[PDB]
Design an enzyme around this catalytic site. Structure first.
Site, short mmCIF file in Angstrom:
data_model
loop_
_atom_site.label_atom_id
_atom_site.label_comp_id
_atom_site.label_asym_id
_atom_site.label_seq_id
_atom_site.Cartn_x
_atom_site.Cartn_y
_atom_site.Cartn_z
N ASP A 103 0.81 -1.30 0.11
CA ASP A 103 -0.12 -0.01 0.04
C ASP A 103 0.60 1.17 -0.14
O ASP A 103 1.81 1.26 -0.74
CB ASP A 103 -1.00 -0.13 1.12
N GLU A 127 0.38 -5.35 -3.56
CA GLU A 127 -0.80 -4.33 -3.40
C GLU A 127 -0.19 -2.87 -3.13
O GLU A 127 -0.57 -2.40 -2.20
CB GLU A 127 -1.59 -4.97 -2.42
N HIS A 269 -6.67 -7.32 -0.60
CA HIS A 269 -5.68 -5.95 -0.40
C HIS A 269 -4.89 -6.58 0.89
O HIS A 269 -3.59 -6.50 0.59
CB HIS A 269 -6.50 -4.89 -0.20
#
Length: 291
Positions: A103, A127, A269
């Site tokens: 992220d 991700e 995710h």
């Protein structure tokens, strides 16, 4: 630190510009630094961290705004957040670094790497916040919510006053539902509206259909390093995934140098909760190959 980090792990706070960056450490050797994103902390890495005992000096941070780190009243711009990251790396004067990034952890660790190329051994990411994302490629519910969050007022109400990012949106986007006790740990850092400020900055900073342009520009800074460094790089992919859209995956294949790409199974995710066995295994094989 939490016991799920495994036996022998310690925690301490690293000073940065008046504030405290909470850090979880284990073992000895060349450093392996885990950086989370929104709205998690070092806790997200626990199962992977534990399985990787002995590969080196394992270092999992809680970014400013998150976990047990300070939660100052600042604007959580990408450049502001990047300063605290830069500060943490300075305090520990790390070299020979293997970054393991997810992220906004990818955005901050790749940007650090790009400016500290002689300090970086290897980088694994999954991700990631990496590139402009096409809204057609994202979950439509998330896209509609982000649009509402970018409105003055409405974002603060949803995220900070009603706490719906942590009580609704976050647990929704797990493939295997999060255990109650684990959902509780993700919420302990955030007892108040003010403590939640960084959580709202996330979706607002996410680059979707070219906006905000400041973020497209920020992320573009690491692109030359990605494209020209010989540093070994590893991208793990998931079905269906979330941030790693097909277009971004195709860009990565065409633009990033010395990139290995490995399927890691089913996940959305927060893949560290979804496939921690597979991820630790693929990381382990890769670190060994590097060694």
């Amino acid at each position: 630190p939490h016991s799920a980090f495994g036996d022998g792990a310690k925690a301490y706070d690293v000073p940065a510009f008046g504030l405290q960056i909470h850090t979880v450490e284990h073992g000895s050797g060349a450093p392996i630094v885990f950086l989370h994103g929104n709205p998690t902390s070092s806790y997200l890495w626990r199962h992977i961290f534990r399985r990787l005992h002995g590969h080196g000096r394992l270092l999992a941070v809680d970014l400013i705004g998150y976990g047990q780190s300070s939660k100052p009243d600042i604007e959580y711009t990408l450049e502001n957040q990047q300063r605290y990251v830069d500060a943490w790396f300075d305090a520990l004067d790390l070299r020979n670094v293997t970054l393991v990034l997810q992220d906004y952890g990818a955005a901050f660790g790749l940007n650090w790497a790009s400016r500290n190329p002689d300090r970086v051994r290897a980088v694994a990411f999954f991700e990631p916040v990496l590139r402009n994302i096409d809204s057609v490629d994202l979950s439509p519910e998330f896209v509609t919510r982000r649009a509402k969050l970018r409105q003055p007022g409405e974002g603060e109400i949803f995220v900070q006053q009603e706490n719906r990012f942590l009580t609704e949106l976050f647990p929704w986007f797990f493939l295997t539902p999060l255990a109650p006790e684990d959902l509780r740990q993700y919420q302990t850092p955030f007892p108040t509206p003010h403590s939640r400020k960084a959580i709202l900055a996330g979706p607002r900073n996410l680059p979707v259909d070219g906006e905000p342009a400041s973020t497209v520009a920020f992320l573009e800074q690491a692109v030359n390093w990605l494209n020209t460094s010989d540093t070994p790089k590893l991208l793990l992919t998931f079905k269906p995934g979330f941030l790693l859209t097909d277009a971004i995956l195709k860009w990565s294949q065409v633009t990033i140098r010395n990139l290995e790409i490995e399927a890691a199974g089913a996940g959305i995710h927060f893949v560290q909760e979804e496939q921690p066995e597979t991820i630790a295994r693929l990381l382990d094989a890769w670190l060994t190959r590097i060694a």
